[PDB]
Amino acid sequence: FDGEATALEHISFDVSQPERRLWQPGHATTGLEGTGGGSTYNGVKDPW
Amino acid sequence: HGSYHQCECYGHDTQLPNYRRDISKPRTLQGYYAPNGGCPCPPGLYCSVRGADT
Amino acid sequence: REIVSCQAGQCGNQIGSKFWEVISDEHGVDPTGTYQGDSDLQLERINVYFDESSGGRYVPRAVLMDLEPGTMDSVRAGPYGQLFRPDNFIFGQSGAGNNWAKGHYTEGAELIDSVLDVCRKEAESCDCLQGFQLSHSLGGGTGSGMGTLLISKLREEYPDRIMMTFSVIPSPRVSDTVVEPYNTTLSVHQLVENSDESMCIDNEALYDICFRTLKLTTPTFGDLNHLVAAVMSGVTCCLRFPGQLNSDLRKLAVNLVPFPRLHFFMMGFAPLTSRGSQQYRGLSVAELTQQMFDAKNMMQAADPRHGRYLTASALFRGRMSTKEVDEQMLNVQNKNSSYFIEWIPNNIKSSICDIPPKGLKMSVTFIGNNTCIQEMFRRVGEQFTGMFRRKAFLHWYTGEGMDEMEFTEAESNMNDLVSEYQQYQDATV
Amino acid sequence: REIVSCQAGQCGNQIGSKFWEVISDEHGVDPTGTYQGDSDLQLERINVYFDESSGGRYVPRAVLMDLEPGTMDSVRAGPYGQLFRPDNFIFGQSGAGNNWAKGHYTEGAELIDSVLDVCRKEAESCDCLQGFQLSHSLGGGTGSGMGTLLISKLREEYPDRIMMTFSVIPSPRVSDTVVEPYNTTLSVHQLVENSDESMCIDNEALYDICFRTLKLTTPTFGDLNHLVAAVMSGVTCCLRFPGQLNSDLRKLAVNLVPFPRLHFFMMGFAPLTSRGSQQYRGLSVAELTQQMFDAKNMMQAADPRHGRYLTASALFRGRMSTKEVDEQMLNVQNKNSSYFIEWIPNNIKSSICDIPPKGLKMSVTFIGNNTCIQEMFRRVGEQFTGMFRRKAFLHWYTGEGMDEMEFTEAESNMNDLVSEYQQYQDATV
Amino acid sequence: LTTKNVSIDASGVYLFDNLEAYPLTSSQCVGKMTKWCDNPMHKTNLRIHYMED
Amino acid sequence: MREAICIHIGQAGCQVGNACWELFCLEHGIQPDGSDDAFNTFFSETGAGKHVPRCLFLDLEPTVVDEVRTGTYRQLFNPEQLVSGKEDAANNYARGHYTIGKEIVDLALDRIRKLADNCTGLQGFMVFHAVGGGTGSGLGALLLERLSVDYGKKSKLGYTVYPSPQVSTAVVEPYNCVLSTHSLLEHTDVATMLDNEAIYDLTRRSLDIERPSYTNVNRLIGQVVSSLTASLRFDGALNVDLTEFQTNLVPYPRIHFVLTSYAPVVSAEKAYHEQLSVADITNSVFEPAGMLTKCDPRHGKYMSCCLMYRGDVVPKDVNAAIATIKTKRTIQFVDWCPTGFKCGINYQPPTVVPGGDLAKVQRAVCMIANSTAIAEVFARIDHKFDLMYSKRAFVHWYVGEGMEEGEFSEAREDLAALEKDYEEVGAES
Amino acid sequence: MREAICIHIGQAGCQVGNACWELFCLEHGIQPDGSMPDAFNTFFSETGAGKHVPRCLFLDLEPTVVDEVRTGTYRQLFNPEQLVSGKEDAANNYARGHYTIGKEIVDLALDRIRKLADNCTGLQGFMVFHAVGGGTGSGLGALLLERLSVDYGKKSKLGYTVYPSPQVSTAVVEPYNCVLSTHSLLEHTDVATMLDNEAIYDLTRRSLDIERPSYTNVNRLIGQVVSSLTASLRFDGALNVDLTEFQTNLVPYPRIHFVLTSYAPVVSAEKAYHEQLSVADITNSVFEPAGMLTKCDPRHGKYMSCCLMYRGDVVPKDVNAAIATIKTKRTIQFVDWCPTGFKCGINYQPPTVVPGGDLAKVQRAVCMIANSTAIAEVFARIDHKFDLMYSKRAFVHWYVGEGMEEGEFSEAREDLAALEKDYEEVGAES
Amino acid sequence: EAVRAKEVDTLLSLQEMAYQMDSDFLNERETVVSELGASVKAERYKGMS
Numbered sequence A: 001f002d003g004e005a006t007a008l009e010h011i012s013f014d015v016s017q018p019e020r021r022l023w024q025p026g027h028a029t030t031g032l033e034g035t036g037g038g039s040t041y042n043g044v045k046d047p048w
Numbered sequence B: 001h002g003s004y005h006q007c008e009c010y011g012h013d014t015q016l017p018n019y020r021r022d023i024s025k026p027r028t029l030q031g032y033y034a035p036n037g038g039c040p041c042p043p044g045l046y047c048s049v050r051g052a053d054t
Numbered sequence C, D: 001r002e003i004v005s006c007q008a009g010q011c012g013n014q015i016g017s018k019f020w021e022v023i024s025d026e027h028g029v030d031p032t033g034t035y036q037g038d039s040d041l042q043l044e045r046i047n048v049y050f051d052e053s054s055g056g057r058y059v060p061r062a063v064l065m066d067l068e069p070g071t072m073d074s075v076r077a078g079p080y081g082q083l084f085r086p087d088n089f090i091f092g093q094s095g096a097g098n099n100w101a102k103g104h105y106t107e108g109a110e111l112i113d114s115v116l117d118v119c120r121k122e123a124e125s126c127d128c129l130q131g132f133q134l135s136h137s138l139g140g141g142t143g144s145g146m147g148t149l150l151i152s153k154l155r156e157e158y159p160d161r162i163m164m165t166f167s168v169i170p171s172p173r174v175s176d177t178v179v180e181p182y183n184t185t186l187s188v189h190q191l192v193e194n195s196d197e198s199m200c201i202d203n204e205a206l207y208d209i210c211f212r213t214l215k216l217t218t219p220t221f222g223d224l225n226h227l228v229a230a231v232m233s234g235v236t237c238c239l240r241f242p243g244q245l246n247s248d249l250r251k252l253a254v255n256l257v258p259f260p261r262l263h264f265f266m267m268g269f270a271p272l273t274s275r276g277s278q279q280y281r282g283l284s285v286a287e288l289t290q291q292m293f294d295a296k297n298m299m300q301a302a303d304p305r306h307g308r309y310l311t312a313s314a315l316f317r318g319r320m321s322t323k324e325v326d327e328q329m330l331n332v333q334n335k336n337s338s339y340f341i342e343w344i345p346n347n348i349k350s351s352i353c354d355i356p357p358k359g360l361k362m363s364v365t366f367i368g369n370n371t372c373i374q375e376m377f378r379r380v381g382e383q384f385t386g387m388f389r390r391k392a393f394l395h396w397y398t399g400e401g402m403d404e405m406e407f408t409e410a411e412s413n414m415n416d417l418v419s420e421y422q423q424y425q426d427a428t429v
Numbered sequence E: 001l002t003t004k005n006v007s008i009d010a011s012g013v014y015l016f017d018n019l020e021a022y023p024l025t026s027s028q029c030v031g032k033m034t035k036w037c038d039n040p041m042h043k044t045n046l047r048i049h050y051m052e053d
Numbered sequence F: 001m002r003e004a005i006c007i008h009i010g011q012a013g014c015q016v017g018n019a020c021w022e023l024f025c026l027e028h029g030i031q032p033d034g035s036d037d038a039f040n041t042f043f044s045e046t047g048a049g050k051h052v053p054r055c056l057f058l059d060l061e062p063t064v065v066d067e068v069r070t071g072t073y074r075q076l077f078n079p080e081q082l083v084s085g086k087e088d089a090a091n092n093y094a095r096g097h098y099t100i101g102k103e104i105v106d107l108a109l110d111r112i113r114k115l116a117d118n119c120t121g122l123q124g125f126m127v128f129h130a131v132g133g134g135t136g137s138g139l140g141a142l143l144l145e146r147l148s149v150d151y152g153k154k155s156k157l158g159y160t161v162y163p164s165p166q167v168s169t170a171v172v173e174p175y176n177c178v179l180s181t182h183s184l185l186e187h188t189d190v191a192t193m194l195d196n197e198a199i200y201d202l203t204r205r206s207l208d209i210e211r212p213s214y215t216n217v218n219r220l221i222g223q224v225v226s227s228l229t230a231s232l233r234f235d236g237a238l239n240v241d242l243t244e245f246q247t248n249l250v251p252y253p254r255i256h257f258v259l260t261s262y263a264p265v266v267s268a269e270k271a272y273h274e275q276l277s278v279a280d281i282t283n284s285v286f287e288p289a290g291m292l293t294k295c296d297p298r299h300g301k302y303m304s305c306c307l308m309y310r311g312d313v314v315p316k317d318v319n320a321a322i323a324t325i326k327t328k329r330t331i332q333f334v335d336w337c338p339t340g341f342k343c344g345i346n347y348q349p350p351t352v353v354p355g356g357d358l359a360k361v362q363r364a365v366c367m368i369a370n371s372t373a374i375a376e377v378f379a380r381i382d383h384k385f386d387l388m389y390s391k392r393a394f395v396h397w398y399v400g401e402g403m404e405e406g407e408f409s410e411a412r413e414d415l416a417a418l419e420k421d422y423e424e425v426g427a428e429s
Numbered sequence G: 001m002r003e004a005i006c007i008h009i010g011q012a013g014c015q016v017g018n019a020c021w022e023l024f025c026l027e028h029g030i031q032p033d034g035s036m037p038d039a040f041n042t043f044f045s046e047t048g049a050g051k052h053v054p055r056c057l058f059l060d061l062e063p064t065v066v067d068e069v070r071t072g073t074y075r076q077l078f079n080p081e082q083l084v085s086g087k088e089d090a091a092n093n094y095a096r097g098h099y100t101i102g103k104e105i106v107d108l109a110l111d112r113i114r115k116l117a118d119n120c121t122g123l124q125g126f127m128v129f130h131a132v133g134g135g136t137g138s139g140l141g142a143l144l145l146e147r148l149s150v151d152y153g154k155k156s157k158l159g160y161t162v163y164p165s166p167q168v169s170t171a172v173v174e175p176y177n178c179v180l181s182t183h184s185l186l187e188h189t190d191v192a193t194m195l196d197n198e199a200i201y202d203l204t205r206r207s208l209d210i211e212r213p214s215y216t217n218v219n220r221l222i223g224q225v226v227s228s229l230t231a232s233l234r235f236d237g238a239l240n241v242d243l244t245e246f247q248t249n250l251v252p253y254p255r256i257h258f259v260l261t262s263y264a265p266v267v268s269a270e271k272a273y274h275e276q277l278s279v280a281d282i283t284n285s286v287f288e289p290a291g292m293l294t295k296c297d298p299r300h301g302k303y304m305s306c307c308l309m310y311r312g313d314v315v316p317k318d319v320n321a322a323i324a325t326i327k328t329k330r331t332i333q334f335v336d337w338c339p340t341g342f343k344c345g346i347n348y349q350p351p352t353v354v355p356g357g358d359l360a361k362v363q364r365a366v367c368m369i370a371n372s373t374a375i376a377e378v379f380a381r382i383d384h385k386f387d388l389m390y391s392k393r394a395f396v397h398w399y400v401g402e403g404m405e406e407g408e409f410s411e412a413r414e415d416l417a418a419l420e421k422d423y424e425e426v427g428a429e430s
Numbered sequence H: 001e002a003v004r005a006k007e008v009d010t011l012l013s014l015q016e017m018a019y020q021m022d023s024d025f026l027n028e029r030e031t032v033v034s035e036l037g038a039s040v041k042a043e044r045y046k047g048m049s
């Protein structure tokens, strides 16, 4: 059982707080998928 | 008291309060605060072997 | 020979609904009303509880009463709810308010005229009225108050007629009411004065018998009323069906009531066993008597070992041997002399009905005039006295015009009841 | 001649479960209670231990007792666990804590109400109760406390009825409890007054018998319980089956108890032989008697050679006449006169039954009231005094309502029993 | 990486995708009557008598 | 039939009414256009096929009324029943009661008259206001007294929001509360406490909301109101009405200021990590942290609790929770109310408002508990009142509006009389 | 029922609880997310959604380890509540953890404990895992032990305490902390369990043959011991025992309840399948001072009561034979007034190994909870350190500036001296 | 005829066991329900379907 290896496989790319992950992401490639088109400053899905 | 010091000796009491008589009594200005208290606004080593009293 | 029944209030109506379920099932009557039995004996004495209609329907001789109409949709929503006459449903806009004063003097009075009209209709259509039966709870407003008013008016025109009352005495542990002692105390004296006999059913005891003996996980109000319905079906078995030693309500009253004010009994049913313990039980009298005289079988939460049995009545139903049903009682009288009053020998009256309840080969209902009945009246009397001492919840009764004296009068009458039970228990030869 | 049985503690519950396994196997009963025997002699006296439901299922007349519901669950889930009545198991929320005080005064005393309810139900259902039966261990909390409390409150209700107890006497060589001498001392003085006769079991001797005689590589509690169950079934062989020279429990008490306090017997079984020597052993009754009086074959760990036999009883089973059951008794009496007592001529009573245990063509059960039975009482006595002098493990008992005076009285009573045994051992004509 | 991530969290991750690591248990002492012991009607104290009466 | 007129007064009343009617529309499946009659108590069935709320939104400031008129439920709300003034009371009880209130109540009573004529079985009025401001306190008092003098003994339920003991969005807020306590005591059948700090604490702790708001506070208030009214809205084993629980809650006419609490109140993440059983939710209710008013019951004595259970709750679990509460000594029931418990059963779980914080729950309970601990907030408020009135602060605003100086002394002294009454009811006899 | 609430105090308690609950989830077949793909009632509670919630209260005064648990794998297993974290640590100060910052958090901890206990209908008691060396585990541990004693009466309290070992010690004032917390461990704890660190380190260095074992390994061993203790009431067995049975069989006097622990057979994978690990062999290893988790030399004292929890394929033959061999072994000696001195409990469940751990799959095991008079020497080391520190008021200003007075230290020292004296007295021959 | 009586008693007992085991009351099932009773269950409500 390679604890460090499975840690790199899963824990390193795990996300615990998606709120924080979106708010202040670093060199993270996981959890960046947020609401698709839900947040537009215009407040409406219509074109600006 | 004995050789072993009591909880009250250490400064803590393992006794259930009498809710019926004391705890469950509501506090009011007249009746509690006026005789022996202030206003409702927001704000030991007792060893029988030694001179302290349990 | 035929009796007319009335259900009062939410509890009374819901108990009577399933009582009529049991009666119709036992007489082979459809939930709609048509007869679908397979025996002549079912139709032989169907007039005891039912009346034949124009189209051959069988309508129960039942009067439904409640100040709350919001709970009288459930009585017709029950599986047998469409059995009753639409004109026997009597309703008021607002509820009794859990107020004996409202149910007896102000709201019930405006509603009692139509109820008595329906009762007089039933009595006049009735050929030879054996009695009036009532099902209600003393802890409510329109069950205690309106029920006591109903029986009081019933005595005014039917003095000698048997007044059965299956009163539901509320218990402190399963209590859900604060004016519970007030209603119970205000209704107990009216029950004493205006009821030939009155058996007390306690919700705590019903819950316990369903919880331990039946062991079934979820006995709801329906399951509690099932036992009361079975007891009501068994108390009138000999009026409707032939038997080796039959009886009727008057005959039980004569053999159970030694003095006019001593007419409060304990109810018991047998057999009652769990699903799991079903293979393991023997179906005989040598097991029915054990369950019947057992402490846990009583539907009243006051253990019969407190006092001594004034009188006992055993309505056995099914295929029994008469000497084996009487020598069991002889043995219990012979060997339990401490719990039977000495100056009244042969305290147990046994009666035999040939036809058992549907689905049961043999059963028995118990009626006991034990002096332990004072226990429930006491344990609610201390509650009533504690409530009354500080004048708690009296404005809700004096706003209807009812004066504070009647509380003391009810206390006096109830204390007299308890005192006479105690004195007759302690009486010596 | 009914025997109503009870099991106390997990030890007693397992022993009783194995006993009912053996009895059902002998009488041809499935775990579901149905009967598939090869002869009607089983149903002739099947009542003695089982009751028949109106559906034909045979249910043991046993009452199970343990403050831990886990023991009830294990027994119910056992191979023959579906046999017992579901309501015949009685359980508590919290266990005895291996405390005689908890099992006898605070927690056990609460649950004995329901224990006595079910026990009296079963005992009364008997047509003629010959006796009560109990299986427990004095080294535990529930068996030592609740068992003695039950026997105490059953003696008061059934004075002249016979009282069997099979108490597992613990030994330091197989010690697994440190409140062992406290519990043993507190239970012995109760069993002295409350039990008309009582024979003791030692796991030491059961283990020794399994190791040297049965030669089991890994003897288990199942094997010990099977031995105890076989001999406890054999003690009632004449009761359950016809025989040449019948006997009953009262007869065993009369012929084995010379004085009221001396009723602690040492017991055994025969024949016993290893798996690899069954076909080589010539099963003759002389060999049966030789093994029966062999010291190592005794299932209580005390050598009879240090004492003398007050009385002995040999319940033989199988096709066999009277001289193999009396003439070798004469032989052993004559050639072991130092091992017997002079002032009691004919120390050994013999009983004959016509139905041997299945799997054997003849067998015997031995019950001996040897004066060496007090050696364990000695050793437990100084064991008790060892902690009593230093007041060790006494706060657990004193915190549950018990006092030092009870301990002193128990030790005095045990010492008095020991002195009576010794003085009757060394008494001269 | 944390030491707990290396040991404890790694063991948990292994347990996620290897269900055979869970050992068989025999809790026969826990049963229907033990579950019935949990029934809340016990705390209601139905038809119970004290010294106070 | 069984109607209930919801009168929202002032800005706080307007927002709580918005939340309440949002919740009611969600429960009854009513779109914001008006598109079994469980809705009859809240939605009058218009002759045009829609459902119009039986509510009156009254406010002197036109901003909130215009916001409602131009919001989402425009087509739901009647263009009348939506009264708007031209200038507010400016947080002045005198302005709200004597100057601007007088000129708008004349038509407010006309609107209430129209609502009453639309009703046929009106149970009573539920008033929603905060006594902190002018319209909520002054106009609320004037409207309450006009309703009392016009409709006689119709039930009145003032779900008032007194100033919280620590935070407050006004400085004249204690003055307004002390001035309005006379009306809230004289012309209000039941007064319920809905302070803001307690609801903030529930939203922060149980809901894990870092930034709670008036939105969440009003959602919780609507949850409580719906929980109490669902007894007459929907079915249940124990259906109770407004006068029903008034009788079962109010022991004395002057003693009607009651506390409220709700559980389980947890978020979606929290919901599936807990056993939301009836016992658990009842314990959470009786704990101080679960109340909608900052008033610890353990600091006082309970007098009468009314529990409102919705969902799969059974009277069994209600009685079990009641038993485990009575056997619990951390809360003391008053000596003259032994039972002290009223129970209502409801078979519809509370529908959650989307976009809020409550989670889909299978069962909930709301407690309307009259207790002697209510004296704490009264002592708080009149200590503020004495501190401010010691040197006549902000009194010129009240005086120049036509309200004399003896107002403050008389209102403070009525509040002190209420102090003494709540001390006396809880004091042991 | 047979529930048992696990209260973890401090960093040591939190990590020990992490190991204990991973082992419990593995044993009961519960995913680290809390779901299952009913003996778990003793440790886990069902939910309407169908998942299981542990019966634990993690409590720390500082949020590092608690937040690390919240961000760990078992975040979905552990309830969002019952995971109480304060804002600032006790900073290795008993006074700070008991009088200033523990006061503002013990109320919330007790509310959580009451919420946990309300769901338990037959709660046997509380197992409190903590290290008295640290400030939080000493101060807040003592405070919570008091409040539990006064809140639940005579409920069972198994205090698994990690004392500071005589030689290896990670703090300088933890002698002060343990001297101060000995009152709680002596009065408000039904059975105190010694779990020092050097003995576990040595047992792992020799009997398990791994170069660098850590706090994870020692916590795994502690969790194995706790699981062995609780398996008697969780699973089947020839001699089932409960938490209220071995207390009676182990505690002779109410104030003498400090007991040593030991475990066998602790072997590696290489050592697993080369030796016939018989029950006699494992019992001999247990009674050997090598197999102990606390370094109280048997020969320097006398055993008063030994409780032996056997797990696996152990038959009473082998248990009784091992007991007889131990009794006839003259190297160890029992106290004179307790002849039997043995409590035995057999469980059918074999030992369970966690993947990624250091133990090996063994078909049988045995754990000893031994009350012996030799335990006086750890207290002798403790107060020999305490008086040396306390001679001229060293590190005492930190304590006296946080709420406690000077009399607390002297009175605790007197309590420790009396704990020496009564142990010597019960060891004295009659 | 005595043997016949025993057979009849046994048969009736087995019928009793069967009926009690299949009984709605003992099995917490509502076999018989009405059109209104399906929607509204005031007394017979046992739990969520």
Ligand SMILES: Nc1nc2c(ncn2[C@@H]2O[C@H](COP(=O)(O)OP(=O)(O)OP(=O)(O)O)[C@@H](O)[C@H]2O)c(=O)[nH]1
Pocket: F009, F010, F011, F012, F013, F015, F016, F060, F061, F088, F089, F090, F091, F092, F130, F131, F132, F133, F134, F135, F136, F137, F161, F163, F168, F169, F170, F173, F196, F214, F215, F217, F218
């Ligand atoms: N719960 C709740 N309370 C509110 C809300 N809005 C105002 N309040 C209460 O109202 C009190 C102050 O009064 P106002 O906000 O001025 O409302 P008002 O009582 O109608 O007074 P006027 O604005 O002059 O009409 C505060 O103490 C709040 O507690 C709300 O949206 N929700």
Ligand SMILES: Nc1nc2c(ncn2[C@@H]2O[C@H](COP(=O)(O)OP(=O)(O)OP(=O)(O)O)[C@@H](O)[C@H]2O)c(=O)[nH]1
Pocket: G009, G010, G011, G012, G013, G015, G016, G060, G061, G089, G090, G091, G092, G093, G131, G132, G133, G134, G135, G136, G137, G138, G162, G163, G164, G169, G170, G171, G174, G195, G196, G197, G215, G216, G218, G219
């Ligand atoms: N056996 C064991 N002991 C530990 C572990 N973690 C910490 N300790 C003990 O904790 C002691 C040091 O105390 P602290 O560093 O203050 O930790 P604490 O006891 O939780 O106290 P706080 O830090 O204030 O929370 C050491 O002597 C260890 O014995 C662990 O994982 N296993």
Ligand SMILES: Nc1nc2c(ncn2[C@@H]2O[C@H](COP(=O)(O)OP(=O)(O)O)[C@@H](O)[C@H]2O)c(=O)[nH]1
Pocket: C008, C009, C010, C011, C012, C014, C015, C066, C096, C098, C137, C139, C140, C141, C142, C143, C144, C168, C170, C174, C175, C176, C177, C203, C206, C221, C222, C224, C225, H043
């Ligand atoms: N056994 C039984 N008791 C009931 C039933 N319905 C109500 N009760 C009891 O009656 C009390 C309420 O009385 P209630 O029916 O409201 O009286 P009413 O207002 O006059 O109809 C409660 O305490 C219940 O315990 C029922 O169906 N069966």
Ligand SMILES: Nc1nc2c(ncn2[C@@H]2O[C@H](COP(=O)(O)OP(=O)(O)O)[C@@H](O)[C@H]2O)c(=O)[nH]1
Pocket: D008, D009, D010, D011, D014, D015, D096, D098, D137, D139, D140, D141, D142, D143, D144, D168, D170, D174, D176, D203, D206, D221, D222, D224, D225, G238
């Ligand atoms: N023969 C036999 N003895 C047993 C069995 N189980 C336990 N014992 C003995 O019972 C003693 C312990 O009894 P205990 O479990 O404490 O009794 P309890 O406290 O009443 O449950 C031990 O000394 C064992 O030798 C068994 O299955 N068979």
Ligand SMILES: [Mg+2]
Pocket: F010, F011, F061, F088, F133, F135
């Ligand atoms: Mg405004």
Ligand SMILES: [Mg+2]
Pocket: G010, G011, G062, G089, G134, G136
């Ligand atoms: Mg720390």
Ligand SMILES: [Zn+2]
Pocket: B006, B007, B010, B012, G146, G183, G184, G187, G188
């Ligand atoms: Zn203390």
Ligand SMILES: [Zn+2]
Pocket: B039, B040, B041, F383
């Ligand atoms: Zn102030």
Ligand SMILES: [Zn+2]
Pocket: B001, B004, B005, B006, B009, B046, B047, B048, B049, B050
């Ligand atoms: Zn002291």
